[PDB]
Design a protein around this ligand. Sequence first.
Ligand code: FES
Ligand SMILES: [Cl-]
Length: 97
Amino acid sequence: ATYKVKFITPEGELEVECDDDVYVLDAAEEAGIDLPYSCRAGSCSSCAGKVVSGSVDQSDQSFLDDEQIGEGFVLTCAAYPTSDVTIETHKEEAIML
Ligand code: FES
Ligand SMILES: [Cl-]
């Protein structure tokens, strides 16, 4: 399966295709979109986003509190789409402060 990932970025809204076993960040980078990252391993705040519609599988992530996952935050370097999904990007600040 291949899913449509819609990114809501501070610059605007863009959609890419992302295979079901490709991390969202990597589909963005493969499309020419520069989204932030640092560890690329699921253990930092840098690539954080917020799921506003649909679902992901981000069981390879460790950094987020279940409160944080329950509120919709996702680590894009560690999240597979499981449906068409819309993600607000550049939410590092919100999962620190
Ligand atoms: S870049 Fe560190 S968790 Fe994604
Ligand atoms: Cl879907």
